[PDB]
Structure 1
Amino acid sequence: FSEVQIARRIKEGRGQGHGKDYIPWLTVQEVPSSGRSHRIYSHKTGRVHHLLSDLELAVFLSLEWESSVLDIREQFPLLPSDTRQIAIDSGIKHPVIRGVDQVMSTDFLVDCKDGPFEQFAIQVKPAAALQDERTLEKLELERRYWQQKQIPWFIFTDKEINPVVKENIEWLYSVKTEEVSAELLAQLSPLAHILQEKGDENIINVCKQVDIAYDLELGKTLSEIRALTANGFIKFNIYKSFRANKCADLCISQVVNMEE
């Protein structure tokens, strides 16, 4: 993936800062195989995050939903000196590509406000991947790294995905719209007001009502919300089908094109 030039990526700030200032070590451009990547906005961090698979997306959405989560720093880099030492102490070949030892990274490093632990890490991997010896070795390197720092670490796989969350993702990500036009975002403020007053009403009813009110073709507003939701500008109760969500279950943001 990366040559000795990694030194420059380190200078770019990759892996430093937090909130809107945090820069992932890996970005969507570093996505392998058919594995689809995602750039979703976060209300908590105020920035767009890079997820490298649908599984990671599912985890991110769960994190963004949690009230106790304060920050989500995805693709977090593990200090090379620490990982080389661990590789040595364990007798495991530190990740190498063409002789250059690679910089390892945990999928998510998250901070909390009142959970059991103020900070914890997560590695996302499909259950099947654990049947490969090399993956296990790499996972041990990662496990030890966090253990060394007394930060709880966990592995999240597909069988940890709530079925409802799963179907919600299947509805939101059959790629409908990705065009984040200033005009699409313009709909955030108006939509926020409507949803706020029609709070206790089912999201689908309110959607039809708006279509009628403004004389839009049936489904227009649902399509808009579906797009703003899939992009992270709108958050909802992922543990409940979107269609069963009340308007009060949705949360809209103040995001403007100043996302550079």
Structure 2
Amino acid sequence: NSSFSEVQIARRIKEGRGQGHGKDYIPWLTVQEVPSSGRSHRIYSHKTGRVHHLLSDLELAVFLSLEWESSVLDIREQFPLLPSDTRQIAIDSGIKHPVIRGVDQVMSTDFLVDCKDGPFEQFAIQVKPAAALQDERTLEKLELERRYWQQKQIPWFIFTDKEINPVVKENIEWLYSVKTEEVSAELLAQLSPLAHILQEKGDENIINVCKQVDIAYDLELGKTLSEIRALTANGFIKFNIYKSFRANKCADLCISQVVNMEEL
């Protein structure tokens, strides 16, 4: 479940969850804490070099949108809010602090983002289904969170399904319509050769190239696209999500050079 006991909390604090930056960051919540009412996603990020933990399709949409922005430097998901601070805020605001079976819970903000330049050098985001904004308890918890970041002087915003760009939405539908395929060492080994092909065919349409690649190497119909699709869904390949994937040119795809730490 998503609720923690006093020992579970203390234990997570010990392993330093919520601490670190970039590749050293460890999220407070993991896909193991995904609510039974949703779907989780584990996705690789070129910006952080980490495999992130997203607990809903909505969080996935926000993550992909953030990873697309050139100015984003770090993305820290499931960022924990200091209990002593939220404890005091609840008291001052007249709100019952989040608690499960008598155990005060550690609150978390879905994303804490750091940017290299631009309008906001740092901002926080809480993701919520729009319908949830009509729920009184949801609103109370959002107020606690709002006050927390206001206290820290860090801009905080709420993002709902209604803020997802329409093209981004259709791309996620296609990319994640079904259960994300597991990335084998064989599939991971395709990043390098695929990167070279996409590099020279930079000016050509990605779907055409995938098909021409199947014809060339006499591969099974739709083989190359299926590989690209799996690597993209897992994050090893990112593209211009604001444009239908089928409309992306090969130069729009960014392929990461990764080493399967299985050997070394």
1:86 is paired with a residue of what secondary structure? helix
**Alpha-carbon offset, residue 258 of structure 1:** 2.5
**Alpha-carbon offset, residue 55 of structure 1:** 0.3
Unaligned runs of 5+ in 2: none
- Note closer, same or farther for the CA distance 1:177–1:146 as it changes in structure 2 (3 Å cut): closer
**Cα distance in 1 between the residues matched to 2:25 and 2:178:** 27
- Note closer, same or farther for the CA distance 1:244–1:162 as it changes in structure 2 (3 Å cut): same
- Note closer, same or farther for the CA distance 1:177–1:36 as it changes in structure 2 (3 Å cut): closer
Alignment check: 8 A CA contact 2:59 2:127 kept: yes
3-12 or 149-158: bigger deviation:
3-12
Instruction: Normalising by structure 1, report the TM-score.
Output: 0.98
**Cα distance in 1 between the residues matched to 2:7 and 2:124:** 27
**Alpha-carbon offset, residue 116 of structure 1:** 1.5
**Cα distance in 2 between the residues matched to 1:92 and 1:160:** 28
**Alpha-carbon offset, residue 250 of structure 1:** 0.3
**Cα distance in 1 between the residues matched to 2:261 and 2:83:** 34
> In the alignment, what sits opposite 1:182?
185
Alignment check: 8 A CA contact 2:239 2:248 kept: yes
1:183 is paired with a residue of what secondary structure? helix
Alignment check: 8 A CA contact 2:110 2:126 kept: yes
**Alpha-carbon offset, residue 131 of structure 1:** 0.6
Alignment check: 8 A CA contact 1:176 1:227 kept: no
1:16 is paired with a residue of what secondary structure? coil
Alignment check: 8 A CA contact 2:30 2:54 kept: yes
1:103 is paired with a residue of what secondary structure? coil
Tell me the alpha carbon deviations over residues 20-73 of structure 1, each in whole angstroms, 9 at most, x when there is no partner. Answer: 111000000001123000000000000100000000000000000000100000
Alignment check: 8 A CA contact 2:180 2:234 kept: no
**Alpha-carbon offset, residue 177 of structure 1:** 4.6
**Cα distance in 1 between the residues matched to 2:92 and 2:262:** 43
Alignment check: 8 A CA contact 2:78 2:108 kept: yes
Alignment check: 8 A CA contact 1:68 1:115 kept: yes
Alignment check: 8 A CA contact 2:80 2:108 kept: yes
Tell me the alpha carbon deviations over residues 55-103 of structure 1, each in whole angstroms, 9 at most, x when there is no partner. Answer: 0000000000000100000000000000001000001000011111000
Instruction: Normalising by structure 2, report the TM-score.
Output: 0.96
**Cα distance in 2 between the residues matched to 1:42 and 1:2:** 31
**Cα distance in 1 between the residues matched to 2:8 and 2:192:** 44
- Note closer, same or farther for the CA distance 1:48–1:259 as it changes in structure 2 (3 Å cut): farther
**Alpha-carbon offset, residue 259 of structure 1:** 8.3
Alignment check: 8 A CA contact 1:4 1:100 kept: no
- Note closer, same or farther for the CA distance 1:61–1:215 as it changes in structure 2 (3 Å cut): same
**Cα distance in 2 between the residues matched to 1:117 and 1:159:** 22
- Note closer, same or farther for the CA distance 1:259–1:83 as it changes in structure 2 (3 Å cut): farther
Q: How many residues align?
A: 260
**Alpha-carbon offset, residue 178 of structure 1:** 2.2
**Alpha-carbon offset, residue 19 of structure 1:** 1.1
Alignment check: 8 A CA contact 1:47 1:259 kept: no
Unaligned runs of 5+ in 1: none
- Note closer, same or farther for the CA distance 1:2–1:200 as it changes in structure 2 (3 Å cut): farther
